[PDB]
Design a protein around this ligand. Structure first.
Ligand SMILES: Nc1ncnc2c1ncn2[C@@H]1O[C@H](COP(=O)(O)OP(=O)(O)O)[C@@H](O)[C@H]1O
Ligand SMILES: Nc1ncnc2c1ncn2[C@@H]1O[C@H](COP(=O)(O)OP(=O)(O)O)[C@@H](O)[C@H]1O
Ligand SMILES: Nc1ncnc2c1ncn2[C@@H]1O[C@H](COP(=O)(O)OP(=O)(O)O)[C@@H](O)[C@H]1O
Ligand SMILES: Nc1ncnc2c1ncn2[C@@H]1O[C@H](COP(=O)(O)OP(=O)(O)O)[C@@H](O)[C@H]1O
Ligand SMILES: Nc1ncnc2c1ncn2[C@@H]1O[C@H](COP(=O)(O)OP(=O)(O)O)[C@@H](O)[C@H]1O
Ligand SMILES: [Mg+2]
Ligand SMILES: [Mg+2]
Ligand SMILES: [Mg+2]
Ligand SMILES: [Mg+2]
Ligand SMILES: [Mg+2]
Lengths: 371, 371, 371, 371, 371
């Protein structure tokens, strides 16, 4: 029977079947619960809402993310999300479908242990596997060597792979992603008089960030241009009909990716993280890591980030080297595409973790069979 | 046995059976007592008259309203009204009928406490329930979301409800209703030489207000038209055969709904009250509160008030929003219709307050079982 | 010449001279305008009243606050307040006195821009400066490290400072303060039959809140004690001689500081806000933030709030940590005391913004010279 | 030239010059016409008699009052009264004197319209003004705040004024005054066998009421004292030499001021009218309305009415309030004294309605320039 | 005058006087700079902090090590460290004290060239000398023959010396020391959910490594024991009061000394490095190198490393040989003790490099006078 590929990110869930080109079900990973007083009896009122139903009714709901910084904090809500993506969205029975799941590098065991235990004793599958998202992003690119930067909603990580061999000592993880940018835009939108304090308007600020923000090639020149004339200002329409206008905040929000000290973090930018991941490898592969910078995730979808990354890496690298950033138009779903490519391979069918080996070894085989 | 739905307003009492379309008994909530000297012996003279009997004999009676601004001030007269509406009008025994009663928001406890105590120890019912009139007005409209303005004889209140969930912090109450408009018309009818000073002629002024008054779309243009030509003047016939004529007072009387400073009140108009109730809610529901303005009560029955409300709310709201005022022709009795819909539901039968729970918990369960 | 320190809160104005211990002029920030019809000619009738004159004549006035939630909404009224506090209360000429002003964190630019423009082109000063109120509250405490919670009439904010260095990413702002508590007490005083609907009786409800309210150590035990016996009931005398009595409402009103869901807000309490501000900082300073909780403002003057805050923070913090709440008896004016300490320092005289730099740079230097 | 102050009451006319302490001409407002057959030729027989000439010849005249309940019913007789008070009593030419006139509150327009038209086209004045009698009664008292009860021959009205600002929604008008008391004494004087049926003996009954009537402090104790012993009986001498004796009727006649049901009226007493006028105002001014009860008019000249009013208002008001009734010895003419004070003010000279503005605006400016 | 002995390691600085038993000043070699925004004026704020002052204030500082892998990378910070250890800690004038300094083998010239230039033109000394740390570690042991392994914070080196004659072709240098172990513990502490990402918490991880880590005698048996029962788990208290618990990571961290492939290095362990250094010497001295294995440095202070080293060397050496590891309790400071012994010898006073020879030969005599 067809295998299931489910990418469980911190903000979005992308589930579908192996062998397909696009994920069938893409929905936000939120659980909404009522916060006001119900006065009308009956009419099918539910105590919880999952996915697009929580987003459509978000004016009377408190929204919670079960995953924070790539780590599942609430397990009942995560089970609700998995039940919704198995029975309501994909409309399949999980007892007859192997499931491929994704996970961020440098994570604790207990996330993967409880993931395997929930997938084998609650939504009991014939087989399961946990894969690294950067290896799938390199699978979707069609190449073998390269350094992958995957930035999503909680985790931004750099993983270099040369000729199918990964270097785990150069894998870097940074807890700066799109939710931090949404919080920073929430903070700096009060600088013009716009107040967004609750969880429902966090989605509005996230929509503003998705539609109107961009990465500047030169930061100081863009701030000088924004201070000189009002040519970079853009208008947005609120759901209640109000119109807001933003200026430099279109490029100050993603600049925290390159300058984390805007939100008080001591770490370096993503360009310096990529460069330090390259020079922590062997020297004879660094050239092949310079021409194969693969970018994946929804956070890498700003329309100025590839040229800016090429500029900073060329400023850091020696001048005799070719820097080439790979930014495909479908890099928002490249982890799922790589998972669908990997699950359809004939050489992958011996690497599943079946139910018999789970019963024989306990929930600890997942660290000796996966990476 | 069939449940009883009784709407006890400040000016009118509407009682009937659950499952019906119209209330069976609609009569004014007045108690009349003689004020002159009786000279003929016997002939069935009573010390008090309740309802239409007090209205027909009002020339020799002092009329008192037991409810003022939604609060019951006289309890013996209110017991007389309840006895009249149980034994004389509805012609039922209250020991075998559950009773549903209505109440205004932001009221004291002691009204509801003594209401439950009188209904359980004097007209002892198998069950009773107290409901919010705006929820019943939304029940009669057939919809789930909307902001309800209910204006009657004592209380004008705004309650917003989104998807069956009410927002109690945006509930607004204003003590300006039809009795204040009757008093203002009583005051400004002396400006043409007509003197109405007693309680019997207050009913005549109320009849003049019901038949001849209307809400102007533009106030200053209508005053200019009334000062220019005598085309807005209307004639009324008094019970003694006198004929009076009124001009601008047809639209100056309900203008106190939009300008309370005519009677010396510092509060804003009903349109500003509705707009401030909408913007005190969550933003993502405000659009659904803009297209579902539900109007209920006898005070909203002037033939100019819906267009005027749409004009003022569209002037207050942003221009990209759709304002739609819901004014059904049967909105004078919509609270009773919603009560009859609610009492006939199969999911409501577990929300009654029976006599056993009243004996177990005392007369204080009515604040933990009702809203 | 002596510098002027003026704290412009949302409800109160505290103005005086630098180097003093107490503010010279403390008066409410209200502008009153007549709403009735004047019938006596002459006798010095004014079109507006500012300060204590508006409070003494409040029975015939509509009172407006120029500042709402720390943001100046009306600028002519704010200019009237500044003219009253410069020429009538302090009795000084502003052309020969530098002025120090206070402002809430996370505010828009345009408040500070128009503040500098009004202070330099209408009440033209030799120099001016805008300071953060939490830094002044830490100045008045005499210490260097600590986390300051300042709660006034519009803004409740948490700012942590370690060894003179502030952490702006942990600064939290919540729009729940004493005016919201006054409105909630206005709402729940109708539950006993007391109606306060106008702006003049809002001051009466504020006086009731100032004299009779207190913070409960345990909320459920206090509600059980109030429901059991009438030992917590207190009586208050209205200006017209009426006597009211309140029970649980003495501690239900400030409980909105710890449970904002009483007024429909999704935010957490002030204790959780302080704890989340502490854990958003660096770890090695958190111990010094646990023993130096500094409380300032008039909203922190309830006689139960320090012990309750210590209890909730000790419940949130690990058990090996020392929690100490700093609540001095003069914390109602600690912002002014810190401003007077800062303006008298010899190292502060190079940080003024003079008129020449204002003319050279325009009204935009105030964001590069102040914080 | 000196302005004219003319108080046109329902029973008396008080005319004089501005700046004086007492009115120059005080005469009854009656027009007498012959009713018998004249038999002697010539000797200067007139078809009408106005003022004291009609009172001295009242045995052969029918006397008519042109003003009934503060409203002018006969305009030719009112023009005769104005001609008599301009040319015969004051002995002035009205073409060179501005005239100040008084009027009761809650009156029709057409009284004031025809008053202005007659004063500008028949007794054509350079300027004219119409003022409220209660504002003049507060002017004569020398104070600014207070609630004025003015009771004369047709109208008893309560007007509260705080700090020069009047509250028109608390202005109360009652059509019970000295002519109703004269009619009630005329009715109850037949209970001892004395018949007064014509208009000439109405003046005799009015004289009996002025000389012999008084207000009882306790009504039931005084009726018990009158029924026990004949110590309250007083004797009066008729113009034909007959001697009458009255007992309880000395205090039963003004008791209709406190109990209108003696003459079949449903309204409350003057004390309840004053108390309801006080509590219909703002709360913060009610204390200043409790210590400044100003009494004016000839009906308030009974020698028991101030103590009785203090007793009933103290019984109605809460016990922590100071009730003080202001009853000056010259309160019979206080409206004229206040008019003379107002017409002599230098700030009043811009509030006259001149002949040019009357020609420009028609006879309708008097409602936009006066109150 | 007394000579100064200053051991400048990669992590610690140990300075003192010749002829003493213990170093007077031991402090970390860190320079801290502020990273947040200063808001309080004056109060002695410094732009840099050196030594224990940077460690005590590390929550608001970025900490930098001037020496990396035994090579000085930042020279201004190294001059700051030398100024702090000359003027603030030792409290001496460097113009009257000769200074003895230490250096790692197989280092570049330019470190020693700039060291001599800074010591002669900035902190100008009468004389200076640079010595090999292993020769000083053999001086402190009191013996003449032996092979010294010195492992500190950046450099782990093996130097064999027989009868006072060193063999430079058998000197081995490996860039694996305590900072690499701290980084590996930082990496593997995320495996249990503990995140340490900044430079301040690197000191916390270093403290955890110093207090809780140990070297296992048999690695696989210890991993089996840790996987079987929780008897090797230890708890540590964070500065913010949090309690962490570690299991196998107590012995996985120093196992990188024996298995460098844990951090991706191709080199052999320290036991194989020592054995290959022994067999690269002459055969007739190897016996004297087998019984005189001298261990020095802070990295050799784990409480399992001597027995493990004896086990691995006895497994590598032939069975007829006596293996004896010399691990004195004061081997953390043995380089300074040997420097103090060498600087107090009467035969060493002719081997100083004075200022005259520095002026005559330039800064290149230090490679022909030292080793
Ligand atoms: N067009 C866009 N521009 C900027 N950011 C985007 C865009 N689309 C999505 N994002 C951001 O990407 C984040 C999630 O991306 P993705 O990696 O696909 O999901 P997840 O992180 O759940 O795996 C969201 O937080 C969103 O803010
Ligand atoms: N056609 C009408 N036009 C204007 N006002 C009306 C009309 N019909 C009724 N009213 C007013 O509505 C008030 C009562 O309305 P309703 O809400 O039905 O009763 P209650 O207030 O007792 O619940 C009365 O005071 C009356 O003046
Ligand atoms: N004793 C008190 N108890 C409770 N609240 C108080 C007390 N005194 C003042 N307040 C509240 O403090 C608020 C203003 O405090 P403060 O911060 O000094 O002024 P501002 O907010 O204008 O800076 C007022 O709204 C008032 O309700
Ligand atoms: N001493 C008195 N005692 C009682 N009533 C009096 C007395 N003097 C005058 N009145 C009454 O006052 C009435 C008129 O008073 P006043 O207000 O001065 O005149 P007007 O009503 O015409 O303005 C008369 O009807 C008269 O009966
Ligand atoms: N008790 C201990 N256990 C394990 N490691 C230690 C201990 N004490 C110190 N260290 C390590 O030794 C290193 C420095 O040792 P040392 O050689 O004395 O200083 P330097 O390397 O600066 O010359 C530090 O990185 C520290 O982690
Ligand atoms: Mg992802
Ligand atoms: Mg109703
Ligand atoms: Mg303040
Ligand atoms: Mg009068
Ligand atoms: Mg060393």
């Amino acid at each position: 029977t067809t295998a299931l590929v489910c990418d469980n990110g911190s903000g979005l869930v992308k589930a579908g079947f192996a062998g397909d080109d696009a994920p069938r079900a893409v929905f936000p990973s939120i659980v909404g619960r009522p916060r006001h007083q119900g006065v009308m009896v009956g009419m099918g009122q539910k105590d919880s809402y999952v996915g697009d139903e929580a987003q459509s009714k978000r004016g009377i709901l408190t929204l919670k993310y079960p995953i924070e910084h790539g780590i599942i904090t609430n397990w009942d809500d995560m089970e609700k999300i998995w039940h919704h993506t198995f029975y309501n969205e994909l409309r399949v029975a999980p007892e007859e479908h192997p499931t491929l799941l994704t996970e961020a590098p440098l994570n604790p065991k207990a996330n993967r242990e409880k993931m395997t235990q929930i997938m084998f004793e609650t939504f009991n599958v014939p087989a399961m596997y946990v894969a690294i998202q950067a290896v799938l992003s390199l699978y979707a690119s069609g190449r073998t060597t390269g350094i992958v930067l995957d930035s999503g909603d909680g985790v931004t990580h750099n993983v270099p792979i040369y000729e199918g061999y990964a270097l785990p000592h150069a894998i870097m993880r940074l807890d700066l992603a799109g939710r931090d940018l949404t919080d920073y835009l929430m903070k700096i939108l009060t600088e013009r008089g716009y107040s967004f304090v609750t969880t429902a308007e966090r989605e509005i600020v996230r929509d503003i960030k998705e539609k109107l923000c961009y990465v500047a090639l030169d930061f100081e020149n863009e701030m000088a241009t924004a201070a000189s004339s009002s040519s970079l200002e853009k208008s947005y329409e609120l759901p209640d009909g109000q119109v807001i206008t933003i200026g430099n905040e279109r490029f100050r929000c993603p600049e925290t990716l390159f300058q984390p000290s805007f939100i008080g973090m001591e770490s370096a930018g993503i360009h310096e993280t990529t460069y330090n991941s390259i020079m922590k490898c062997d020297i004879d592969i660094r050239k092949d890591l310079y021409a194969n910078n693969v970018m994946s995730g929804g956070t890498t979808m700003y329309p100025g980030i590839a040229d800016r990354m090429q500029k900073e890496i060329t400023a850091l690298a020696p001048s005799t080297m070719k820097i080439k950033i790979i930014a495909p138009p479908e890099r928002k779903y490249s982890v799922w595409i790589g998972g669908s490519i990997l699950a359809s391979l004939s050489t992958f069918q011996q690497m599943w973790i079946t139910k018999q080996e789970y019963d024989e070894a306990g929930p600890s085989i997942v660290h000796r069979k996966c990476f």
